[PDB]
Amino acid sequence: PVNIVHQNAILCETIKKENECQRLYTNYSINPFKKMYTLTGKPNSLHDEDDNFLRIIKRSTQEPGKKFEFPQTEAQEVGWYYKPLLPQDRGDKRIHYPRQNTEITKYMDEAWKQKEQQE
Amino acid sequence: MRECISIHVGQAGVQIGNACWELYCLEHGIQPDGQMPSDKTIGGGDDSFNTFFSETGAGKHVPRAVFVDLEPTVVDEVRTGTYRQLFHPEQLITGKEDAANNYARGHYTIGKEIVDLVLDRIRKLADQCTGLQGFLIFHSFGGGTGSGFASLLMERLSVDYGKKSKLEFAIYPAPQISTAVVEPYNTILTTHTTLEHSDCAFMVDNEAIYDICRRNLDIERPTYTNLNRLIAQIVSSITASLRFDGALNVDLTEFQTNLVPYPRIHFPLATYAPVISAEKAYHEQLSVAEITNACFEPANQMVKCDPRHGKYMACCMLYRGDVVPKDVNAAIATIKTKRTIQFVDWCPTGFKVGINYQPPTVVPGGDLAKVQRAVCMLSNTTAIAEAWARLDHKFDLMYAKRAFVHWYVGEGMEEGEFSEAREDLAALEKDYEEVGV
Amino acid sequence: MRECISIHVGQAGVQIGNACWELYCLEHGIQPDGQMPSDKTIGGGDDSFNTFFSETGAGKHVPRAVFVDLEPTVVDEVRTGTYRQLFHPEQLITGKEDAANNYARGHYTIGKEIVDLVLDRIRKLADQCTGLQGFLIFHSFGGGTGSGFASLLMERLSVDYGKKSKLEFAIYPAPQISTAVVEPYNTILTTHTTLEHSDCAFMVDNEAIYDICRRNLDIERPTYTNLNRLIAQIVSSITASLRFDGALNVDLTEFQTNLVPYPRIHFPLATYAPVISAEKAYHEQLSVAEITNACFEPANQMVKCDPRHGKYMACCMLYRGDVVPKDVNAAIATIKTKRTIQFVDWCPTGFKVGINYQPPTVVPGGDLAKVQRAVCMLSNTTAIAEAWARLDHKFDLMYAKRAFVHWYVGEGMEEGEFSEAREDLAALEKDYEEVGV
Amino acid sequence: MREIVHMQAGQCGNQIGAKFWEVISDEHGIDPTGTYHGDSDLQLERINVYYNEATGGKYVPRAVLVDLEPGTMDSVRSGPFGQIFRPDNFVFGQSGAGNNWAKGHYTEGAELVDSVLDVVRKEAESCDCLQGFQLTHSLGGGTGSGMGTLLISKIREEYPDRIMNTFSVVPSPKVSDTVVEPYNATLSVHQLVENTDETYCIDNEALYDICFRTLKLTTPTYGDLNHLVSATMSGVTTCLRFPGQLNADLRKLAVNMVPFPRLHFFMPGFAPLTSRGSQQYRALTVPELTQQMFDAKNMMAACDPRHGRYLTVAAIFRGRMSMKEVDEQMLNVQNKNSSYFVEWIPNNVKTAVCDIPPRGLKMSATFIGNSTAIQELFKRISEQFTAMFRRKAFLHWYTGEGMDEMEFTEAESNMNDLVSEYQQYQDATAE
Amino acid sequence: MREIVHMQAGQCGNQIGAKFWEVISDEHGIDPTGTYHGDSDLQLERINVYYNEATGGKYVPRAVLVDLEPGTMDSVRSGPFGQIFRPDNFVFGQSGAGNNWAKGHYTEGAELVDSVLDVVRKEAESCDCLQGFQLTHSLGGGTGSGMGTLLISKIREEYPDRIMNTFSVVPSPKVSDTVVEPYNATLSVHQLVENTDETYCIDNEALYDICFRTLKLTTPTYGDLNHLVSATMSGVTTCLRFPGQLNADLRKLAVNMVPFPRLHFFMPGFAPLTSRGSQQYRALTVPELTQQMFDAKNMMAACDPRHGRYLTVAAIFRGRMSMKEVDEQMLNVQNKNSSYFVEWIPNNVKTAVCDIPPRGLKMSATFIGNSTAIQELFKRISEQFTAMFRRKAFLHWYTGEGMDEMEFTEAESNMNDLVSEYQQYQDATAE
Ligand SMILES: Nc1nc2c(ncn2[C@@H]2O[C@H](COP(=O)(O)OP(=O)(O)OP(=O)(O)O)[C@@H](O)[C@H]2O)c(=O)[nH]1
Ligand SMILES: Nc1nc2c(ncn2[C@@H]2O[C@H](COP(=O)(O)OP(=O)(O)OP(=O)(O)O)[C@@H](O)[C@H]2O)c(=O)[nH]1
Ligand SMILES: Nc1nc2c(ncn2[C@@H]2O[C@H](COP(=O)(O)OP(=O)(O)O)[C@@H](O)[C@H]2O)c(=O)[nH]1
């Protein structure tokens, strides 16, 4: 092994790296699918904001469907129309027949609630 | 006072769950956030959601579902979708790597890592339970998560809960349509390992769903959305008697006793009617007899088996909507006076019927039409023997000289398990034959 | 009348007190400058703050706290912090040079010049009081000021006060993690010097709360501040009975007499429930049965030590919030009938309950969401035998060839008392294993 | 999550992987100066499968560039997207050894194997759950067939449970392509047999036939062929980067791909390749998509599929479509061309759908077919190797490097066993 | 108020002290004249540790610069941050020393010992609560060895309880940079054994290696080489002047590292350690800091850490971070490195995390290792001392002013004795 040949090979490689090839990135950017939280400031610490960050976190946690008017991948199409068409008055016993419990039933439902836990 | 815990495993479990839970929420008035809004709440009652939801917080309903899969994407879409606020975040369980259509991967490796977590979550849900009638487990025989980790769930739930029943909704591989190649291996393995554990497994062919969607629904461009929407309507018609008052109410433990004649013969076939479209429903006169015979047609049967090639062991009819038991009984009498509809001679009475007053609600953006009555027949015919003889044959051609076997035997299964599964299915086919004679 | 005297010794103890007095101030409505806010408590004030804060004629509230540390960094940070005018400026005792993880420096050389002033101020606070209940001594087992100075302080209070109760809050060394290297030395020394004067010492481990913050509170970067907030919630839950009212009110004088069976095993644990965050707390039933079940879980103790290889010798529950006592009885019945939770053969009576009406109070800038119920659970279980045994084994490995002993023999403690503490911890371990027969 | 590291090796590897990172960065919406500029939210879903996070919202590709002469990586880090990589991952050798397998394997290449494995460990322990390794090269020359095989062997003996795919540019049926290439290809596919859970064989002449029989390309150059390779080499792992109705990752494809371990040599292909003039006279549907999939002209390995039998085919679709139509077209092709599929494997098709299309191209599809027709390529390489090996030709370099004829003879033993295996499974019957 | 007195001895001592005072004045916001040119008030709370208040706003450093020639005094006075020192503290001789231990310990410099001790007493008796003395000398030279060791002996005789640390520069493995360096290295470390309490053996060769391989730095100049050691200075003395979550002072480090009293030779380290180019391509977190912490290309001593065993490792963290991660990574490095650490001492890591990160950095780490690998330097200098003492090389120009051979005899005796305890406690079985 010949030392100066090793170092100036490394020198040629380096000057080829830090020639004009650094861009000095001009955008912080936000990826709204990772989250980190490490401040948890001291209560006595008196020594310790971004509307675009509020907008991007709102569009991250904005319940998608309200941010696009046309759908996406069909799992975001299967529930595109969650609003039930017609007013659908559910109190109408003539049309809708939901099972309504009774005060004679709710009490002993509560009675076997802790009875059934050790079946 | 009654409910049922739904465990949805695999991609074919979670997409059917996305269809099912939107159907239940839109049927019960639940908004996707989990809050019952105005014009939906009624005073001093309406406990129909108690069989699938739980009242929580200060007015929120959370479902009794466990969404499990070994891979991401298809579950974190649910975590970041329309129903991202409906589910408890500890009920949306994912793994790191995928079972890779490998039953060995699903059952003897990384599938047996989140098994403790899912059984802990199921134990917590059964602690929150106020009276359990069973587990609705949604999967495909398919490959990987729907076979290995689902069969592990069968084993753990059977050795833990015991007396509680487990209804499966299982997507069978089609006769002609296939999307994988190791599914003849996976289906036989999971059938062997869940034969002793499953209580009743309702069988579904995707190819038959595409046939009925193109024929009756007039959907020349169908997809998994329509398939799982129709399967959701089937399971809703199963569970409607737990939620709505009817002339004849039939629950899970009645359904199992009425259907299966033997503890190994527990694989029935479901069909739904009408699957008529919105444009073609204007010209029809939907009535009890003409939907009963429509269910008995050999084209709405949802596994590609003609019931002519066999005998009906038993039959359960579930009616929803404006249905009168006189027309029910007249339709059943007409079906019995038909000659080609052959029941077994050892089962003279062959119909268990139920009628519920609540009509099947339809989801906007779907393809099914709103109808005033519907039938959900879940017959137990012998025609499934032809299909499983066919897939035993498809297993035999691949297992003739050890195709796709090195993965299983290198990652943990032994060679003899394949032979044990094959002889178990042979014995079961002979059981079908000797019962059918 | 029912009061406390809170002695905060060591950097860890001062951090606990920094969280604790913020929580106490927010509970009792005091401002950070010490003044009660204007246009409130117009009915004649309230006697709720009298447990912690003394009242002067200027309308300001002076806490009954003695901050002490030999290192003049954290106490000076308190003195220059937001809670500058709240504390008594002469209660903020601080040294000039720290013990620097040396029991000899904390107990003989450096600590003996400051224990004099600390006793003087403890006597001043005790004389300016009516009906003293006990001393809340917040320290840690890391050592130096935490071990040597706390041991010397407690030895000096033993001859002064005698029958008064001394509740200790110590941070136990983690089962895999130790920051200092002489932690076996200083833990064995502080245990030897606190086995005879302590009445009830709560160990609160660090990586246990790290795992709790990872799972329940759902934060991947928990600093010391979250740990101090959880310990502050624990001590607020245990001292809420002296300030508020409700059902059975449990006093500082006598949960020590209902938790300690023999006067060497005064070493219980602590567990808060629910420790769940906001989004996960929103989607669940916060009910008495499930919160007690979460209290009796191996993944929720504040010390990483499985409660399955040991038996619950005694246990005390504190239900802070609107808790109906019938659900409490049903819950404790369910845990008593469930298996895998074991009590010693001399334990048909093993629970003491105390229920309050005041709900837990949320601190702004924290992570725990406010919920209407909480249980602070204190178990004096014998499962800590394994932890005591591995600390004994670590001390044996250290002292087997005289590592890190030259400091102690140069400025204090000797090999003779090292052997004395060795045989004393041998006696403690053999009594601890003699109990479980 | 799932993550893959890409491992350019040689001149061919360092060009194809550079165009690959250009294409996948344009797909995920990354500028040459490493920042997000896209308009669709779903691009930043699975950045972590190919990129590592760097401070200030930066995504650096998990890529290792390996060469035994500096000039190739100097040309790579000169043009667009050359400054997106970690500069410490550029591992260079100031020796040469560009067209000698022996001197690239047991010589001055093997002094660089420690450095390239150190970079591999650094890129592989900085992720939560590593899935596999993708490595790109050609089966000819010293820096892409000796370095590649030694690196694959070392990573296989280090991390045996991860998936391993290599994309190799296999030789041409006609012409020469660097005369000692039969030697290099023979005792490179020798190490490709035991390792490399799946290998993608790409033929240069097949690529030229694709660019000029269907795509026009009146000035077809070199980067367009690299684009054609990179389109499918990105479309294989689109189920890891985008959600779909039916996803299928590398382990899924590997499990349902090879019936036997020594059968992992495939033919890639891209469906919606058409000329600019003929773009107007087209209707992008699943029928025409699978019509251009099942297409001997669009195979990037020449090795005509109708001269053998298909073992397993796979389709990875991308876009808005109906899988009734997808499964119906696969059913139709298997029902019609039944003699070209092995009859002891019923339904030998694996299809998956991801509903995220590329830029433009309303629908697209990627074909991966494992057939018995690669025995033509292996027989050709065996015949040329025996012709140049019988009269001791072009062997004194290897023997003076330090090898011996026993390795070459067992290399032909393994290759002839491989040919016999493909022939046996080609003519095997069901019963 | 904890107090440290700073002393420089020789050319190396004055240069490294000048760089340390420059860096600490930049941290505390003190201009070269003396006025506080800073922003926050938190750096005035503990400014009395390394500064003494004067009339007006001036803050004079407590530095007791020593030399036997005025040349380096003139250089440090003309250089930047040179007028900040008190002009009554520059104590320099006239005769000459700087390569001879006899000339720096027994005569010539022996006259200056009284003056230096007078200045040391004046500076150390103006302190409220003295903690220790930091000598920044260099063993193996002249006054860095002779004057440094004699001053250490006098201060340890006068003040037996205060902590005492040296930052001596050990001889390089290659080159010599001084012919009588093997003589003076032993003759200095003999006094360094039973007098000092901490010795941070910094190496020129490892400094070259860490400036070249990690920092690139095509020209190494000279300012960066001492800038790294000054970063180690300010990293290890952070807790005495800045508040933090975990506070460990010099005495806590003393009771944490050295198990047995003559085992106090520590390996320094500093590890944000980013290169010129690969800094945007690198994400700085606790995993990356710990990876640079436990890396052989980062410990700035000559000895290879693979040889021997780790007795203990300190980890001084600066910045705002999480205790769970900075705790679990020091757990998992021990879990990964089984035989590297000693088994008879469990969990050989002392962490200490403090706020207020250094200037122009997010987070920072200061490695301090007490591995048994440092016995190699002791062994090698014992080898050269034997090799030249068997033929009395350079011995008469030691004996010219006293220096009977018994000093060499029971210098070499202890020289090999320390090798004996390092070997005995290196690989001893626990039980
Ligand atoms: N009807 C219907 N079937 C589906 C759907 N998704 C998947 N399948 C079926 O699932 C089969 C594939 O097996 P899966 O259960 O999906 O396997 P997996 O859940 O993806 O688990 P892995 O293979 O390990 O990833 C296919 O044959 C499909 O028929 C769906 O949304 N609707
Ligand atoms: N929960 C919690 N624990 C802490 C905190 N600060 C220090 N500790 C614990 O304290 C241990 C270190 O020993 P300490 O008790 O801090 O020693 P000290 O109180 O500083 O006393 P001296 O060392 O003599 O100055 C560590 O192992 C930590 O577990 C804190 O803010 N919160
Ligand atoms: N398709 C394709 N083929 C290439 C590319 N680069 C080189 N080749 C083929 O590789 C053969 C020679 O490979 P070579 O450069 O010697 O590989 P090396 O030894 O690793 O440098 C040539 O005949 C080319 O046909 C490329 O970017 N794309």
Ligand SMILES: Nc1nc2c(ncn2[C@@H]2O[C@H](COP(=O)(O)OP(=O)(O)O)[C@@H](O)[C@H]2O)c(=O)[nH]1
């Ligand atoms: N960092 C640093 N090291 C030095 C300097 N001068 C000498 N050394 C090292 O110290 C050894 C000799 O020191 P020497 O010049 O005799 O110190 P002196 O007594 O002050 O003259 C050599 O091995 C050098 O590597 C210096 O100015 N700075």
Ligand SMILES: [Mg+2]
């Ligand atoms: Mg899947």
Ligand SMILES: [Mg+2]
């Ligand atoms: Mg301290």
